[PDB]
Amino acid sequence: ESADLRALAKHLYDSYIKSFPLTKAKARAILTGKTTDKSPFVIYDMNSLMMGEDKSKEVAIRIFQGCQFRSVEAVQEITEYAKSIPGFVNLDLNDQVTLLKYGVHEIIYTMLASLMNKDGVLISEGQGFMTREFLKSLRKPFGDFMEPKFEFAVKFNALELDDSDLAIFIAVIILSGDRPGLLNVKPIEDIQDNLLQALELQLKLNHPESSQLFAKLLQKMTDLRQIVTEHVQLLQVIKKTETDMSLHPLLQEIYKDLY
C-alpha cells in the first residue's frame, strides 16, 4: 500500500509541475535572492507602478482588473491539474464542474501563499513584486481585498510546505464531497480517502520532525473557507458601486449561486 501511495504522490507532483509554471520553489528563489532566478521589480507606489507598467482610469481599478486576469489564468491551470487527479475525469460531468466551481478559489489562495511573504506578493510570473502596504493603501474597498490573504499566507507559510506537499494537498481540496449540489458523493469521497492517505504518508516522510503537520494542514481549511466568504462579500460591493466594470465570464459562472 505504501508503495502505491508513494506512486500517487509522485504522479501528482509530476502533474503539478507540468500544470503550474511558477512553483513555490521558484517563488522562494526569487524572494530570497537565489542565483537560480532573477530579482523582481518592486512596485510600492504610483510612480514605481508606472515605471513597472511595462512588464478603467484609476490605479485601483486597473490593478483589480489585472489581478482578475491572473485569477482566470489560475483557474485554467487548476482545471488542467484536476484532470490529472486519478478518478476525477471519470466522475459525473456535473460533479466535475461543481468540484471545480467551489474548489478553485481555495486553491488559488493556497498557492498565492507560495508567492507571498510578510511584505508583499510576486506578480507577473515573478518578474514583479507588489508590496502589501501599497495594496492596503488602495481606495476602499479595493484596499481590503489582499490583506486577509496576507494574514493567511504568513500563517500557512509557517508550515514550510514544499511543492510536492502542496500537490497532494490541493488534490485533497478539489475532491471535497461536501460541495453543494454534488450528485454522487461516494465516488468523490473514495478518491479523497486515497489522496488523504497519500498526503499523510508524504508529510510523515518529508517532515519526519514536524509532529501532527497533517492535522495542522487540514485545520488550515477553516481559514481558507473563511477567506472566500469574505472575498465574495467584497465582490458584491464593487458590483453595485462600479456598474461599468465587468467580471470575466469564467469567473462569473464560478461565483453564480455560490453559497
Ligand SMILES: CCCCCCCCC(=O)O
Ligand atoms: C486589488 C487586488 C484585488 C484582487 C481581487 C481578484 C478578484 C477575482 C477573483 O475573485 O478570482
Ligand SMILES: CCCCCCCCC(=O)O
Ligand atoms: C494580487 C494579484 C494576484 C491575485 C490573483 C490571484 C493569483 C492567482 C495565483 O497566483 O495563485
Ligand SMILES: CCCCCCCCC(=O)O
Ligand atoms: C499590475 C496589476 C497586477 C498584475 C497581476 C499579475 C499576476 C499576479 C500574481 O501572480 O499574484
